[PDB]
Amino acid sequence: VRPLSVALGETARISCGRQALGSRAVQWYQHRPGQAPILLIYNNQDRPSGIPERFSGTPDINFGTRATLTISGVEAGDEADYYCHMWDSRSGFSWSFGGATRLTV
Amino acid sequence: VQLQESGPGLVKPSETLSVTCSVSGDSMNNYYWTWIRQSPGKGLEWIGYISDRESATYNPSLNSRVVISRDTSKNQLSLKLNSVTPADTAVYYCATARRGQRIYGVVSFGEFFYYYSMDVWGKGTTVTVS
Amino acid sequence: TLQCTNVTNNITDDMRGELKNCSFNMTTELRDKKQKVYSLFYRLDVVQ
Ligand SMILES: *[C@@H]1O[C@H](CO)[C@@H](O[C@@H]2O[C@H](CO)[C@@H](O[C@@H]3O[C@H](CO[C@H]4O[C@H](CO[C@H]5O[C@H](CO)[C@@H](O)[C@H](O)[C@@H]5O)[C@@H](O)[C@H](O[C@H]5O[C@H](CO)[C@@H](O)[C@H](O)[C@@H]5O)[C@@H]4O)[C@@H](O)[C@H](O[C@H]4O[C@H](CO)[C@@H](O)[C@H](O)[C@@H]4O[C@H]4O[C@H](CO)[C@@H](O)[C@H](O)[C@@H]4O[C@H]4O[C@H](CO)[C@@H](O)[C@H](O)[C@@H]4O)[C@@H]3O)[C@H](O)[C@H]2NC(C)=O)[C@H](O)[C@H]1NC(C)=O
Ligand SMILES: *[C@@H]1O[C@H](CO)[C@@H](O[C@@H]2O[C@H](CO)[C@@H](O)[C@H](O)[C@H]2NC(C)=O)[C@H](O)[C@H]1NC(C)=O
Ligand SMILES: *[C@@H]1O[C@H](CO)[C@@H](O[C@@H]2O[C@H](CO)[C@@H](O)[C@H](O)[C@H]2NC(C)=O)[C@H](O)[C@H]1NC(C)=O
């Protein structure tokens, strides 16, 4: 777990510590305590049906750009921990789930 | 296809630990079934997945002592833990994933890798060791 | 003599050594002292 304090309204950009070493296929997860985790966006931009159309990820192009996630239009109840699942060509199978990200308003 | 998990929550240490998981809604023949365990004080830890050729892969940080048998008669996915340590107290999560493919070069040479995304998740069943 | 290691290993493909990551000793600056350097060599230019 890691600390990240935000407030209502202003957009928040959150990335993950693990750095890419190739072409990445990151996916983001929402672990609200108690309830089951929900997939926000896969393939760095491809959110599934149901997730609000306001969380936008960084597209993979011009290798080097950090994999950061945008949660603009944050709400009061956003007190969960996120998860950046990094898949890259070189690093191989990504068994680990990365580091969490506590949300505070 | 909300999965229902029937966990006892009370297993003696160094014994057998079995947790079942229902499927609900639709059958399970073209989907990948993963199992994720989250322990207090840390995040979730992916264990493995089973599908296709029935050759389920296991995490290299679990010593492969766990097995994931996928059943079709009763449509359940149980977990068989052997030689479990008394420090395995963690809530187990039952979820499935779809296997996409990422391509960066000529796919005839083999320039592509498979990545899995957990489309659906189960509420899970909290199980400890006593 | 180079202490080559596969750049990928358990990274991708069949563990092919198309590229090797070779570290060796060389005399940088002074002819007495020799520090450990490294470079990327192709499998076509290193003989075990
Ligand atoms: C010698 O000849 C050989 C043989 O011809 C050549 O070998 C070829 O070389 C090229 C170049 O390296 C390789 O291209 C790569 O292709 C992959 C895969 O592309 C295919 O699959 C994509 C996804 O398929 C999925 O979705 C579809 C439905 O959409 C579904 O049906 C399918 O089953 C699967 O589920 C398709 O989108 C893609 O379509 C593309 O090509 C069409 C023409 O075929 C064209 O009409 C389309 O408009 C579209 O352009 C195709 O079918 C590509 O993924 C890869 O490019 C990605 O990866 C590089 C790596 O960094 C990245 O820079 C690119 O930007 C791109 O990444 C985008 O897409 C990712 C996957 O969606 C996504 O995760 C990224 O975040 C990123 O997304 C962002 O950027 C894109 C860019 O515009 C943007 O659109 C997004 O919205 C977002 O902003 C490569 O291009 C070939 O694979 C390879 N082999 C073959 C057989 O072709 C060789 O090159 C020749 N060499 C010489 C010297 O001549
Ligand atoms: C080739 O091997 C060298 C080791 O001699 C690698 O250099 C190390 O890389 C790691 C990770 O980037 C660093 O933490 C070390 O400090 C590096 N050591 C030195 C002496 O530089 C190098 O990364 C390897 N290169 C490739 C492409 O695999
Ligand atoms: C480069 O030279 C160093 C010594 O300057 C080598 O490291 C030594 O390796 C021998 C192996 O038997 C050890 O007994 C020594 O203790 C090492 N000395 C050290 C680490 O200071 C090293 O193997 C050489 N590398 C090459 C030739 O690639």
Task: State the Cα–Cα distance between residues B14 and C6, nearest whole angstrom.
Answer: 41
Q: Max CA-CA distance within chain A? A: 39
Task: State the Cα–Cα distance between residues A101 and A58, nearest whole angstrom.
Answer: 18
Q: Which of residues 86-105 of A touch C (CB under 8 A)?
A: 89-92
Among B25, B20, B18, CA closest to B2: B25
Q: Match 């083999």 to its residue by tokens.
A: B110
Residue B31 structure tokens: 């989907």
Chain B residues near residue A36 by CB distance under 8 angstroms: 93, 95, 121-124
Residue B51 is part of which domain span?
1-130
Q: How many degrees, rounded to 5, is the angle at CA A27 between CA A56 and CA A67?
A: 65
b/e B108-128 (16+ beta carbons within 10 angstroms → b): eeeeebebbbbbbbbebbebe
Where does A1-105 have alpha helices with state H? none
CB of residue C25 inside a 6 A radius of ligand 3? yes
Residue A105 structure tokens: 């308003």
Among B29, B107, B12, CA closest to B75: B29
The region, left, alpha or beta by phi > 0 then psi within -120 to 50, assigned to residue B25 is left
Sheet holding A27-31, edge to edge: A38-41, A27-31, A81-85, A100-102
Q: What experiment produced this structure?
A: cryo-EM
B78's enclosing H/E stretch is: strand B77-81
- Which domains, and CATH codes, for chain A? 2-105 (2.60.40.10)
Q: How many degrees, rounded to 5, is the angle at CA A51 between CA A45 and CA A55?
A: 45
Residue C35 structure tokens: 């520090």
Q: How far is CA A38 from CA A31, A47, A51, B59, in A?
A: 7, 11, 9, 22
Count of domains observed in chain B: 1
Q: Report the atom number in ligand 3 closest to the C-alpha of C34.
A: 5
